[PDB]
Amino acid sequence: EYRLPKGILDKEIELIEKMGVQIKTNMRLGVDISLEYLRKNYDAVFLAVGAWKSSTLGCPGDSAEGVIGGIEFLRKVSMNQPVNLGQRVLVVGGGNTAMDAARTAIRLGAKEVTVLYR
Amino acid sequence: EYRLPKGILDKEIELIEKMGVQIKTNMRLGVDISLEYLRKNYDAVFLAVGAWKSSTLGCPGDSAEGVIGGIEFLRKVSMNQPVNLGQRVLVVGGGNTAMDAARTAIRLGAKEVTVLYR
């Protein structure tokens, strides 16, 4: 939020909806609807699902209690859902996700945030 | 059709639709839509799917080319889809489906229709 407030995003999405686009939220493909249904009742189908699965540490013990994906953590913080963030946080990576996670952890009260890059 | 014309049925279904009921045809449960989606976005779910699978002859050779279910045959005739009805038809059973199939086969030009009942 400190880099992109969501009011602006909401306003622009309302602008897109005002053009006749109908947005059916909470409708996941492969759970709520199938691809074949879309192919049957729509002239064209565009898929823009993004890359919504984070990369694990790729080391033994990367499934313990206290390891979380960067985008999963950021999505939890965005929805105001509780995160079990301690006082010593290690952000592994050097991309935009790592920086955002580190600064969000700083803003969430973590006393020490360290970023480790290969 | 000779026992219940479909114009009357269409008129009554239009009457039901005129009360605010919305009918989403060509929407099969488990293929186009899922039960869990219905449970998620509806206060109540009623299931009235009927008994739409016919009973096979239960004898060896009941999967040959020229054996068809009674209600599958009647559904094909109702939709005006082609049926490979010969000239000697054997309707096995004694229910309403058997009578309807036999009389429809008579009306479809079969020279001999016989009904076999246990």
- Alpha-carbon Rg for chain B, nearest whole angstrom, is 18
Interface test with B, best of A31, A32, A33, A40 (most B CBs within 10 A): A32
Tell me the residues of chain A between 11 and 50 that have a Cβ less than 8 Å away from chain B: 26, 31-34, 36-37, 40-41
Q: Which amino acid is at B82?
A: P
Q: Pick A32's closest partner by Cβ from B26, B31, B37.
A: B37
Secondary structure (DSSP) of B70-118: HHHHHHHHHTT------SEEEEE--SHHHHHHHHHHHHTT-SEEEEE--
Interface membership of A96 toward B (CB under 8 Å): no
Chain breaks in chain A (C to N over 2.5 A) after: none
CB contact at 8 A, A76 and A100: no
Query: What is the separation of C-alpha B66 from the centre of its chain, rounded to a whole number of angstroms?
Result: 18
Q: Pick B34's closest partner by Cβ from A26, A32, A36.
A: A32
Resolution in angstrom units: 2.7
Cβ contact, residue pair A31, B34, below 8 Å: yes
d(CA A85, CA A73): 9
> Which chain B residues contact residue A41 at CB under 8 A?
26
Nearest residue to A41 via CA among B57, B37, B26, B54? B26
Secondary structure (DSSP) of A44-89: ----------PPP--STTTTSTT---HHHHHHHHHTT------SEE
The residue assigned the tokens 């979380």 is A68
d(CA B76, CA B96): 17
Residues in chain A: 118
What tokens were used for A59? 């080391």
A115: exposed, middle or buried (Cβ count in 10 Å: 0-12, 13-18, 19+): middle
> CA quadruple B2, B4, B8, B14: dihedral positive or negative?
negative
Contacts (Cβ under 8 Å, ≥6 apart) of A94:
A115, A117, A118
A23-32 long-range contacts, Cβ below 8 Å, gap at least 24? A26/B40, A26/B41, A31/B34, A31/B36, A31/B37, A32/B34, A32/B37, A32/B40
What value, to the nearest 5°, has the Cα angle with vertex B80 and ends B77 and B82? 80
The separation between the first and the last C-alpha atoms of chain B, rounded to the nearest angstrom, is 28
Q: Which amino acid is at B47?
A: L
Nearest residue to A89 via CA among A109, A112, A107? A112
Whether A29 has a binding-site annotation, put simply, is yes
d(CA A1, CA B50): 52
